[PDB]
Design an enzyme around this catalytic site. Structure first.
Site, PDB file in Angstrom:
ATOM      1  CG  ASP B  25      -1.916   1.283   1.331  1.00 39.36           C
ATOM      2  OD1 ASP B  25      -1.765   1.809   0.124  1.00 39.36           O
ATOM      3  OD2 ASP B  25      -2.962   1.142   1.863  1.00 39.36           O
ATOM      4  CB  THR B  26       2.153   3.420  -2.608  1.00 40.33           C
ATOM      5  OG1 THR B  26       0.871   3.659  -3.440  1.00 40.33           O
ATOM      6  CG2 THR B  26       2.648   2.348  -3.564  1.00 40.33           C
ATOM      7  N   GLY B  27      -0.028   4.346  -0.289  1.00 38.83           N
ATOM      8  CA  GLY B  27      -0.944   5.253   0.602  1.00 38.83           C
ATOM      9  C   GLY B  27      -0.612   5.069   1.924  1.00 38.83           C
TER      10      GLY B  27
HETATM   11  C1  LIG Z   1      -5.002   9.170   3.994  1.00 39.04           C
HETATM   12  C2  LIG Z   1      -4.407   8.191   2.752  1.00 39.04           C
HETATM   13  C3  LIG Z   1      -5.253   6.872   2.947  1.00 39.04           C
HETATM   14  C4  LIG Z   1      -6.955   6.921   3.216  1.00 39.04           C
HETATM   15  C5  LIG Z   1      -7.663   7.001   1.816  1.00 39.04           C
HETATM   16  C6  LIG Z   1      -4.631   6.053   4.308  1.00 39.04           C
HETATM   17  N1  LIG Z   1      -5.013   4.526   4.153  1.00 39.04           N
HETATM   18  C7  LIG Z   1      -4.171   3.396   3.145  1.00 39.04           C
HETATM   19  C8  LIG Z   1      -5.352   3.370   1.995  1.00 39.04           C
HETATM   20  O1  LIG Z   1      -4.698   2.763   0.938  1.00 39.04           O
HETATM   21  C9  LIG Z   1      -6.493   2.361   2.550  1.00 39.04           C
HETATM   22  C10 LIG Z   1      -6.108   0.998   2.748  1.00 39.04           C
HETATM   23  C11 LIG Z   1      -7.340   0.273   2.936  1.00 39.04           C
HETATM   24  C12 LIG Z   1      -7.942  -0.764   2.072  1.00 39.04           C
HETATM   25  C13 LIG Z   1      -8.924  -1.376   2.260  1.00 39.04           C
HETATM   26  C14 LIG Z   1      -9.999  -1.273   3.676  1.00 39.04           C
HETATM   27  C15 LIG Z   1      -9.527  -0.373   4.610  1.00 39.04           C
HETATM   28  C16 LIG Z   1      -8.132   0.541   4.436  1.00 39.04           C
HETATM   29  N2  LIG Z   1      -7.340   2.421   1.262  1.00 39.04           N
HETATM   30  C17 LIG Z   1      -8.633   3.255   1.203  1.00 39.04           C
HETATM   31  O2  LIG Z   1      -8.893   3.580   2.180  1.00 39.04           O
HETATM   32  O3  LIG Z   1      -9.262   2.906   0.040  1.00 39.04           O
HETATM   33  C18 LIG Z   1     -10.812   3.305  -0.018  1.00 39.04           C
HETATM   34  C19 LIG Z   1     -10.898   3.880  -1.310  1.00 39.04           C
HETATM   35  O4  LIG Z   1     -10.987   2.703  -2.273  1.00 39.04           O
HETATM   36  C20 LIG Z   1     -11.476   1.682  -1.580  1.00 39.04           C
HETATM   37  O5  LIG Z   1     -10.910   0.713  -1.726  1.00 39.04           O
HETATM   38  C21 LIG Z   1     -10.286   0.276  -0.086  1.00 39.04           C
HETATM   39  C22 LIG Z   1     -11.343   0.930   0.881  1.00 39.04           C
HETATM   40  C23 LIG Z   1     -11.571   2.142  -0.111  1.00 39.04           C
HETATM   41  S1  LIG Z   1      -5.436   3.978   5.766  1.00 39.04           S
HETATM   42  O6  LIG Z   1      -5.626   2.397   5.502  1.00 39.04           O
HETATM   43  O7  LIG Z   1      -6.626   4.584   6.201  1.00 39.04           O
HETATM   44  C24 LIG Z   1      -3.906   4.224   6.571  1.00 39.04           C
HETATM   45  C25 LIG Z   1      -2.766   3.081   6.547  1.00 39.04           C
HETATM   46  C26 LIG Z   1      -1.369   3.175   7.098  1.00 39.04           C
HETATM   47  C27 LIG Z   1      -1.280   4.594   8.012  1.00 39.04           C
HETATM   48  C28 LIG Z   1      -2.487   5.636   8.107  1.00 39.04           C
HETATM   49  C29 LIG Z   1      -3.866   5.337   7.404  1.00 39.04           C
HETATM   50  O8  LIG Z   1      -2.084   6.531   8.876  1.00 39.04           O
HETATM   51  C30 LIG Z   1      -0.644   6.388   9.251  1.00 39.04           C
HETATM   52  O9  LIG Z   1      -0.195   5.126   9.104  1.00 39.04           O
END
Ligand SMILES: CCC(CC)CN(C[C@@H](O)[C@H](Cc1ccccc1)NC(=O)O[C@H]1CO[C@H]2OCC[C@H]21)S(=O)(=O)c1ccc2c(c1)OCO2
Lengths: 99, 99
Positions: B25-27
């Site tokens: 997860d690059t995000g």
């Molecule tokens: C602030 C930027 C992102 C939020 C947007 C941060 N997310 C990583 C994402 O990759 C999550 C990772 C994720 C993936 C699936 C379920 C929960 C979290 N993906 C996500 O939220 O995607 C949503 C939009 O497309 C859909 O597909 C998946 C959920 C929806 S996160 O899961 O909440 C996350 C991970 C490590 C962290 C953090 C936050 O704060 C610091 O360390």
């Protein structure tokens, strides 16, 4: 380009004619942008992340240019913590993970 | 290898003597894993995403293997719906985004 991950993979995008900064987010299925004005019709949708579910406006077939690469696809608009480019558009610009 | 993004970039990891599946997860700034009872000390932390924040336990200097690539760093454990490998470890295995 090849993008390393010591910093957040932030890039400039163009959507609705306006430039923005967005995060290339391989963990997001979908592209979600912070509250903004976009032309055309939209439908209300729900999306879930790490902390629960939010209400978004779904815009289909939207033109968006990501780091000089054109895409046309679904863009969700709502109270996301940051603008994220998800896999639905990353595939369109030919983005892969490599190690 | 090279991983396309047509589907979620899920890979097998080894942590605390257990094998699990996790997103590259690059995000994600940090690495967040499903509830597991790791030994040793930890500190509380809150991390935010779509939907709000979750409470997690921060363990430092944890050994993680990702597709045979070894890394060591901070791992957050909590009620996350998905295991995500964040940039703190993706850099250690040499992972880049490419388009
Ligand atoms: C602030 C930027 C992102 C939020 C947007 C941060 N997310 C990583 C994402 O990759 C999550 C990772 C994720 C993936 C699936 C379920 C929960 C979290 N993906 C996500 O939220 O995607 C949503 C939009 O497309 C859909 O597909 C998946 C959920 C929806 S996160 O899961 O909440 C996350 C991970 C490590 C962290 C953090 C936050 O704060 C610091 O360390």
């Amino acid at each position: 380009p090849q993008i390393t991950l010591w910093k957040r993979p932030l890039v400039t995008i163009k959507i609705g004619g306006q430039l923005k900064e967005a995060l290339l987010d391989t963990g997001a299925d979908d592209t979600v942008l912070e509250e903004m004005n976009l032309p055309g019709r939209w439908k209300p949708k729900m999306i879930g992340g790490i902390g629960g579910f939010i209400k978004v406006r779904q815009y289909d077939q939207i033109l968006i240019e990501i780091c000089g690469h054109k895409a046309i696809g679904t863009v969700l608009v709502g109270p996301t913590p940051v603008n994220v480019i998800g896999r639905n558009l990353l595939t369109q610009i030919g983005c892969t993970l490599n190690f």
